[PDB]
Design an enzyme around this catalytic site. Structure first.
Site, mmCIF file in Angstrom:
data_model
loop_
_atom_site.group_PDB
_atom_site.id
_atom_site.type_symbol
_atom_site.label_atom_id
_atom_site.label_comp_id
_atom_site.label_asym_id
_atom_site.label_seq_id
_atom_site.Cartn_x
_atom_site.Cartn_y
_atom_site.Cartn_z
ATOM 1 N N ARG A 1 47.558 57.096 67.438
ATOM 2 C CA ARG A 1 47.599 57.953 68.615
ATOM 3 C C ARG A 1 46.247 57.920 69.339
ATOM 4 N NH1 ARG A 1 49.212 64.425 67.683
ATOM 5 N NH2 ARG A 1 48.149 65.049 69.612
ATOM 6 N N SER B 1 44.787 60.270 71.236
ATOM 7 C CA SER B 1 43.987 61.468 71.035
ATOM 8 C C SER B 1 43.196 61.391 69.724
ATOM 9 C CB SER B 1 44.819 62.750 71.079
ATOM 10 O OG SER B 1 45.814 62.757 70.078
ATOM 11 N N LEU B 2 43.732 60.742 68.702
ATOM 12 C CA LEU B 2 42.982 60.571 67.442
ATOM 13 C C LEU B 2 41.960 59.465 67.539
ATOM 14 C CD1 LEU B 2 45.800 61.236 64.810
ATOM 15 C CD2 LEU B 2 43.703 62.548 65.091
ATOM 16 N N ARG C 1 40.207 58.877 70.085
ATOM 17 C CA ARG C 1 39.123 59.513 70.856
ATOM 18 C C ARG C 1 38.278 60.397 69.949
ATOM 19 N NH1 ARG C 1 43.419 60.416 74.807
ATOM 20 N NH2 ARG C 1 43.207 62.646 74.310
ATOM 21 N N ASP D 1 56.770 42.326 61.051
ATOM 22 C CA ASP D 1 57.688 41.228 61.115
ATOM 23 C C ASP D 1 59.073 41.661 61.513
ATOM 24 O OD1 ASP D 1 55.833 39.438 60.076
ATOM 25 O OD2 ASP D 1 56.721 39.434 58.032
ATOM 26 N N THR E 1 52.985 52.036 56.212
ATOM 27 C CA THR E 1 51.776 52.485 55.502
ATOM 28 C C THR E 1 50.625 52.614 56.483
ATOM 29 O OG1 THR E 1 52.553 51.443 53.470
ATOM 30 C CG2 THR E 1 50.191 51.874 53.647
ATOM 31 N N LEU E 2 49.955 53.756 56.453
ATOM 32 C CA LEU E 2 48.839 54.103 57.313
ATOM 33 C C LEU E 2 47.527 53.973 56.559
ATOM 34 C CD1 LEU E 2 50.405 57.322 58.868
ATOM 35 C CD2 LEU E 2 50.519 54.952 59.736
ATOM 36 N N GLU E 3 46.577 53.310 57.193
ATOM 37 C CA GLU E 3 45.284 53.023 56.616
ATOM 38 C C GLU E 3 44.319 53.919 57.360
ATOM 39 O OE1 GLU E 3 45.703 49.073 58.037
ATOM 40 O OE2 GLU E 3 47.224 48.653 56.508
#
Lengths: 175, 175, 175, 182, 182, 182
Positions: B117, B119-120, B122, B135, B143-145
């Site tokens: 996002r 806003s994040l 920033r 793919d 999965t979020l890093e």
């Protein structure tokens, strides 16, 4: 439009897209995997001033490199400890530049994006400091901007390091 | 070609693109907003060696997590201070893996890109360590890093965390 | 489909894509170069809580800024040393927000991606903390999320800082 | 790019392309089949001057029509011959206008091409003699211009007569007008 | 989007589009030229009722055919006249069906349009009277529907007769059936 | 993908597509209207053998032409009849070649399709009897092949006669030659 596996094979076959060396096993659903070279550059000036020529040193590894986060504060003992424990040839902290093994040439109707491998992103290892789009008409190997953001990461010579995603241009470019 | 709002609605309606759960209010002009799950993974080995199986711990939060930059040097007092002041359930420094709530399935003619996002971004909070292309044929949650690069950032369970951008493939892939 | 040089010129000519100011010399094969403004924002709260209004300070530079990695631990002497040695007007560590000079407006059939300049990525300077896609229908200057990851980097007012890549949407969006 | 079956179904489902009546079994790999209405127009003028409103006759067939090539020289005796032998409701020669049963609306990002069906082309029957592209924004039934080029051909009310092929536009069109109510 | 020469060559090389026989010198900027077979069909029926199997004659020319407009009223004397004067193997009037020499297979992401060649259109000779789009998934030779609209025209065995124009589909088509063996 | 009005204007503005003369009010939602020139060609040969240069007549109309179907059997008396009654400059039967007023140049990433206009198709007048795709790289006016299929039709000098539909190619074409000067 992003090129599929079948499209990448076609454009490589007809030399529309040059990839040297090429391995058909590195073609995925919509990308081509690239691999890590053995040569790296480390900068050795105090600050980076792009108005000047930058001083650097070239390093070649035999097998592997340990990439530590910035401010890991490596001492002589710690580097030896890591070399003995993890069998790495070289230990660096902060940024290091690498290269793909692969040399590419793009035609006037394709732009490619480099992205780092997902499995490496999941251990907070990045090999690009930008979104990584490459101009239509580009010729060269891909320079890798390697930084670790969590703990030290072992990188192996010739490992798959990232992928190229190829997109059609709406019209041919004039380069 | 990037799918517009209307295209995303169509492909979800016909189950060409699976998004579970789906909220039509999360469809933007040319993206779909995804949300932050309550489960996280933290690695607990000394270095990351992808030739090995990685040791990790799983954390679940009730409401919120404070993500501190690496080398924030968290002490026991500091963690309690942050918990009392900001009402966070967990305080981490450096990298943490998260997940979207959303499970997706992509057809053979679509690739999607995850981006964090705006806003994040920033506030120097990233939730992807790569350009984030997925793919054609993928099935799974994303999965979020997660890493903070300036000051600690509060993240809330179920908040909008990033977006999926969907692109047509030039041809169907064979996966 | 990514717009080529010729397409960007056409869409600017017909005011389909607004770029103010515009320099035809900034059109590349498949991108438009954007430049760095003189105004920056630095946050001055302890943590970032997006549920709250963020406190910040505005800085304007005359010529140049030195962006140091987080935890460079700048002291008064060190800042003066850098100002005298590198002729910079301001020295910051960690994240700083900037802006492009350029104001853009996107139509309902285009999405653009910001990426930081390659030459700056090669010195571990990033100006975006996300993949940087911009919604169809956007109006505004581009906010830059600047962080250095290796050594301090000098940035100059009005320098080329990154590029916009424009993609067609498959259909017009409803914004 | 030409819409596939999958795309046609999506665009009809969301009312991006209107087709009334819609039959899902008329969706082919990359086209939509349309059917022949029972009303026809035959002009009655010595020459066609587009500055004028042409004179014409309307007819409605109960089931079928025999369309004969131009200069087939149809007498009342030949007409009753054919009617009796082939059980057709009407016998005409030369050009006849027809209509699809289907009413369509195209959005500002789609153009469509009508083509007469292959199995009728195989017997030298056409239902359009231009390329058949239709503007984005179009709303209406499709006018059919029916001509037989070899021998007379029997056509039946409601038969599949041709297909619409839908293409994406590169950018949305100005359909020529904008309407803002409130 | 229409395939360019570069694309046609790629898709033929990888067997995504089958063309048998293939001649690389028949690839144009954005089309592929096809050639006229030596076999033709002429129907023999008073009217064409598609409910039936039509009656026809097959012919094979050794080198060339004269195709006359409908109602040219060909007598044995006029036929031998033309045969003698222009050295044609056969003289026909009205519609004649032919075939390309080329056999094609289209993948699920391509549709093709056949068009008769411009130089023959310039003498009012057509080899299709509908728009000529072909479904994704199609496998076969192309049926030619040949009609002369002004004066008789000589056609020669194996001559270039028209072109295929290939378009990408927006999405892969369901070609109407799936086959799973093992 | 088919160029919209917005695209046509862009490509004409930058000289990517040349159209001479250009009229901005001839840009439709996804096509460009072209107009009928005052010069026509009528062949004078018993048969058309493409191995030869055909014999022809050129004519120039001051304002209008009556185009009659083939086998209309025009005598001097019928010609003067029509000329007197409808004020046409010339009366012809069967196929007549015409030309657009407009000269075009296509770049290596565009193909165009000519189609005769719908309002003329509605009276069974065609100005092309093939699909009408034009190669990328083409430079020229458009040759019109005019045939009336029902009754004679009046055409006027400079009238809108048809449209060009422009499509993007998937990749740039080799237009068949390269020229390097200096």
């Amino acid at each position: 439009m992003i090129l599929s596996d079948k499209d990448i094979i076609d454009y490589v076959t007809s030399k529309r897209i040059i990839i040297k060396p090429f391995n058909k096993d590195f073609v995925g659903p919509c990308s081509y995997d690239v691999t890590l070279g053995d040569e790296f550059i480390i900068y050795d000036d105090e600050v980076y001033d792009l108005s000047k020529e930058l001083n650097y040193k070239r390093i070649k590894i035999k097998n592997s490199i340990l990439v530590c986060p910035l401010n890991y504060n490596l001492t002589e003992e710690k580097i030896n400890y890591f070399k003995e424990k993890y069998n790495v040839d070289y230990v660096v902290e902060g940024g290091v530049l690498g290269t793909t093994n692969e040399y590419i040439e793009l035609p006037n109707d394709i732009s490619a994006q480099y992205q780092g491998r997902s499995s490496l992103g999941r251990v907070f290892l990045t090999s690009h400091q930008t979104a990584g789009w490459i101009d239509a008409g580009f010729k060269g190997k891909i320079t890798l901007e390697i930084v670790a953001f969590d703990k030290p990461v072992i990188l192996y010579k010739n490992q798959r390091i990232g992928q190229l995603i190829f997109s059609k241009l709406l019209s041919p470019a004039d380069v």
